[PDB]
UniProtKB/Swiss-Prot annotation, chain B:
The gene is PSMD4. GO terms for biological process: proteasome-mediated ubiquitin-dependent protein catabolic process. It comes from Homo sapiens (Human). One of its GO terms (molecular function) is polyubiquitin modification-dependent protein binding. GO terms for cellular component: cytosol; nucleoplasm; nucleus; proteasome accessory complex; proteasome complex; proteasome regulatory particle, base subcomplex. Component of the 19S proteasome regulatory particle complex. The 26S proteasome consists of a 20S core particle (CP) and two 19S regulatory subunits (RP). The regulatory particle is made of a lid composed of 9 subunits, a base containing 6 ATPases and few additional components including PSMD4. Interacts with NUB1. Interacts with SQSTM1. Interacts with UBQLN4. Interacts with UBE3A. Interacts with UBQLN1 (via ubiquitin-like domain). Interacts with DDI2. Belongs to the proteasome subunit S5A family. This is 26S proteasome non-ATPase regulatory subunit 4. The 2 UIM motifs are involved in the binding to a multi-ubiquitin chain in a cooperative way. Keywords: Isopeptide bond, Phosphoprotein, Proteasome, Repeat, Ubl conjugation. There is a cross-link at K122 (Glycyl lysine isopeptide (Lys-Gly) (interchain with G-Cter in SUMO2)). The chain holds residues 1 to 191 of 377 of the full protein.
Swiss-Prot record, chain C:
PROSITE patterns: MPN. It comes from Homo sapiens. Keywords: Acetylation, Isopeptide bond, Proteasome, Ubl conjugation. This is 26S proteasome non-ATPase regulatory subunit 7. Residues 5-140 form the MPN domain.
Curated annotation (Swiss-Prot), chain D:
The keyword Zinc applies. The keyword Ribonucleoprotein does not apply. SUPFAM superfamilies: JAB1/MPN domain. This is 26S proteasome non-ATPase regulatory subunit 14. It comes from Homo sapiens. GO terms for cellular component: cytosol; cytosolic proteasome complex; extracellular region; ficolin-1-rich granule lumen; nucleoplasm; nucleus; proteasome accessory complex; proteasome complex. GO terms for molecular function: endopeptidase activator activity; K63-linked deubiquitinase activity; metal ion binding; metal-dependent deubiquitinase activity; metallopeptidase activity; proteasome binding. Its EC number is 3.4.19.-. The gene is PSMD14. The lineage of its organism: Eukaryota, Metazoa, Chordata, Craniata, Vertebrata. InterPro entries: JAMM/MPN+_dom, JAMM_MPN+_peptidase_M67A, MPN, RPN11_C.
């Protein structure tokens, strides 16, 4: 699908002959993946008071 | 084992259409073909049985294959409607057996006719002497109804096993709708 | 319905090699095979083929055979090695359009809807492109039969491809009149193109062989075009078609007069660059 | 023994089968079989080639599937004529030609049945017109490498004609395999019917080429050809100056008149002379 390789996209290459094998989606940089949803904390507005 | 290639020529002509034979004319001749293609397979695994017709359009309905599943699938709602044309029925039967993988096989054809034929007897004896120079032995078995004491088929088999052929037969049809399993019990027992 | 066909030189060679491997029969055999390929953007493409076993007895020449088991599994392999590749129709060797090729096509239209045939050449001699193809059209129409059907020729050429032009131009090594200048057109279409119109003029002479003596069907739908060719024959030289012709000759040759005038001074300057390397070189070197 | 004059005759049909199967599935190393007609101790002839489908994603030569070839070997046997497998091939995509350590093992399984199966490498990328990148190879025994003995016992001055590339010389040549000189089997049955059929112009030169725009294009060049002659009214004027070998290095930044000015004169001639002549043959032939 050579019409879908827009300038900006992220692709995978070949090592030996160095050709394009597969288009990829974006990357999500695992510092931010381990920043998103690692909190199972379950505090609520009942626990805060005074403000 | 012995080297042949069994080729059945089924009858989808328009006179094989009624219900005088007990299941159907179509099903009773089909299972007769089934038990003899089980007879030719189990005596020799090299023989394959495909079917051809002798109607107006001599179609390769099923190809010559050792499978019978296409044979069983096409012979349901097979539409046996058509004017019989046997004058081309020899040429479709002979030239098929030269398209085979082995010419060292015994050229053997069975032929089922259940309809009145309008051939010339002079044209078939030119085709018979054509088959004399081609060394072909064909045992034609009569089904259905026909001109009784089958016309032009005695003189064809006689001019088929001529010139030291002397091995062919002509199984004629009895004009009574009995069960046709014992009718074909003579070619399965001996030749 | 179909614009044109595109034939690659692979399948062109992939018949003649089969004509050699059956050429030992001597007496008579036509090469009939299965044509593989696609068609995209309304243009018929031809890529691959093979040939199917086939015989023909001369007496009662309506008995043909196509071993469809050989047609099934070998296409089953070719679809397996190449899913992009598929069936496109069929072909036959086509010396002179044999008789079975009215119902070979109707035998195997259950695979390709527009089951096109291809007539090829085995003895190459002409002044054109010896690759013919037809199309199947039927008619409940004018006069002949209640069931009437006649093939119609769709235009045909040899299409190229980037991968095969390496191999095509490698296997020639004989003659290739490239370097398109002022004389490539003179021979590809001015020597040859005038003699192109030779055999098109001579073709309607071959139909004209029936004036009172030839074959029994006469015209009905052949002469409306021929009545128009003599009618649409171009304008005679009386109008300003005289005057506007000399108008552009007095315009096109002006550019030729300027451009040729330029070519002299350029090569005159190149003469001076050669006298700078003759008189200024003999005293130095010797 | 072998006389290093082994002279592989191939074909005309197989090379087109080699490059098409090598190009359509390019970056994965594809392979297939070589179905030829074996001849004497000296030469070998490979006339037909059928391609074998792959196994999975990944550049490999994976293995042969003898279910496939055994049905294929008797497929055309019942139709055409018998042949016998005389070798096999694969395709380096953009490398060149050598036997890798993966390539050599599937070769060594094939030399066990017959001792003359040819390993063929084709490269459908470094090939343009007069290059079809080739040089099939065949293994040499590593038993003789320990002996220090040089094989193939040269009896003719026919082997050492092609020089091997240095990149193939980095690989197992010449310590595990050898090159073989090849030519091609051409014949008039094929030669004429591909020459006279490739580029044939039908009725193009019997046209007028957009008759209002040809004379319009006859000014679309001439107008800037004026100023390109003003450069030619410029560059000649700074001569008898710094030694025109210096006028070779220094003119790589900006455009020159002299080459560009004899350029359009060829364009403004063949566009005019072809179009003016073809107008004056239509007047005679068409009434
Ligand atoms: Zn490799």
């Amino acid at each position: 699908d050579k019409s879908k390789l827009k300038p900006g996209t992220r692709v995978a290459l070949d090592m030996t002959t160095l050709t394009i094998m597969r288009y990829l989606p974006r990357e999500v940089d695992p510092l931010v993946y381990n920043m998103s949803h690692e909190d199972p904390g379950n505090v609520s507005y009942s626990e805060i008071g005074g403000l | 084992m012995v080297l042949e290639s069994t080729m059945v020529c089924v009858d989808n002509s328009e006179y094989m259409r009624n219900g005088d034979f007990l299941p159907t004319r179509l099903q009773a001749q089909q299972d007769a073909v089934n038990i003899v293609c089980h007879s030719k397979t189990r005596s020799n695994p090299e023989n394959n049985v495909g079917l051809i017709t002798l109607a107006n359009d001599c179609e390769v309905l099923t190809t010559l294959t050792p499978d019978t599943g296409r044979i069983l699938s096409k012979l349901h709602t097979v539409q046996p409607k058509g004017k019989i044309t046997f004058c081309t029925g020899i040429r479709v039967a002979h030239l098929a057996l030269k398209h085979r993988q082995g010419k060292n096989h015994k050229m053997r054809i069975i032929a089922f006719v259940g309809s009145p034929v309008e051939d010339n007897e002079k044209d078939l004896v030119k085709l018979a002497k054509r088959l004399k120079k081609e060394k072909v032995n064909v045992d034609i078995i009569n089904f259905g109804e026909e001109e009784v004491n089958t016309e032009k088929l005695t003189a064809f088999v006689n001019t088929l096993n001529g010139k030291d052929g002397t091995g062919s037969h002509l199984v004629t049809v009895p004009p009574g709708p009995s069960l046709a399993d014992a009718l074909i019990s003579s070619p399965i027992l001996a030749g | 319905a179909v614009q044109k066909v595109v034939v690659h030189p692979l399948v062109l060679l992939s018949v003649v090699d089969h004509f050699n491997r059956i050429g030992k029969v001597g007496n008579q055999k036509r090469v009939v095979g299965v044509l593989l390929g696609s068609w995209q953007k309304k243009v018929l493409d031809v890529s691959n083929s093979f040939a199917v076993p086939f015989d023909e007895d001369d007496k009662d020449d309506s008995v043909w055979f196509l071993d469809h088991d050989y047609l099934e599994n070998m296409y089953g392999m070719f679809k397996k090695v190449n899913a992009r590749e598929r069936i496109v129709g069929w072909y036959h060797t086509g010396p002179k359009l044999h008789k079975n090729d009215i119902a070979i096509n109707e035998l195997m239209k259950r695979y390709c809807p527009n089951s096109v045939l291809v007539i090829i050449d085995v003895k190459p001699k002409d002044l054109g492109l010896p690759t013919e193809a037809y199309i199947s059209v039927e008619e409940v129409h004018d006069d002949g039969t209640p069931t009437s059907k006649t093939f119609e020729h769709v235009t045909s050429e040899i299409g190229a491809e980037e991968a095969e032009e390496v191999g095509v131009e490698h296997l020639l090594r004989d003659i290739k009149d490239t370097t398109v200048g002022t004389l490539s057109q003179r021979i590809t279409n001015q020597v040859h193109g005038l003699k192109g119109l030779n055999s098109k003029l001579l073709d309607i002479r071959s139909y004209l062989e029936k004036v009172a003596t030839g074959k029994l069907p006469i015209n009905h739908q052949i002469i409306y075009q021929l009545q128009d060719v003599f009618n649409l024959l171009p304008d005679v030289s009386l109008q300003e078609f005289v005057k506007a012709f000399y108008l552009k000759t007095n315009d096109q040759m002006v550019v030729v007069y300027l451009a040729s005038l330029i070519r002299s001074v350029v090569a005159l300057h190149n003469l001076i660059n050669n006298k700078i390397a003759n008189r200024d070189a003999e005293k130095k070197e010797g | 023994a072998v006389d290093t004059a082994e002279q592989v005759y191939i074909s005309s049909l197989a090379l087109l089968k080699m490059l098409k199967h090598g190009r359509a599935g390019v970056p994965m190393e594809v392979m297939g079989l070589m179905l030829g007609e074996f001849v004497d101790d000296y030469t070998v002839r490979v006339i037909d080639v059928f391609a074998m489908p792959q196994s999975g994603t990944g550049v490999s030569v994976e293995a042969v599937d003898p279910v496939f070839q055994a049905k294929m070997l008797d497929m055309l046997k019942q139709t055409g004529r018998p042949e016998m497998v005389v070798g096999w091939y694969h395709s380096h995509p953009g490398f060149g030609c050598w036997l890798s350590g993966v390539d050599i093992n599937t070769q060594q399984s094939f030399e066990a049945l017959s001792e003359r199966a040819v390993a063929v490498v084709v490269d459908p990328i470094q090939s343009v017109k007069g290059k079809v990148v080739i040089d099939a190879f065949r293994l040499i025994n590593a038993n003789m490498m320990v002996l220090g003995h040089e094989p193939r016992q040269t009896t003719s001055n026919l082997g050492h004609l092609n020089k091997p590339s240095i990149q193939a010389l980095i690989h197992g040549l010449n310590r595990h395999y050898y090159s073989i000189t090849i030519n091609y089997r051409k014949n008039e049955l094929e030669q004429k019917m591909l020459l006279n059929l490739h580029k044939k112009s039908w009725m193009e030169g019997l046209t007028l080429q957009d008759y209002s725009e040809h004379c319009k294009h006859n000014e679309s060049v001439v107008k800037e050809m004026l100023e390109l002659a003003k450069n030619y009214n410029k560059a000649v004027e700074e001569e008898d100056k710094m030694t025109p070998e210096q006028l070779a290095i220094k003119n790589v930044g900006k455009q020159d008149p002299k080459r560009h000015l004899e350029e359009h004169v060829d364009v403004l001639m063949t566009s005019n002379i072809v179009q003016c002549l073809a107008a004056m043959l239509d007047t005679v032939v068409f009434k």
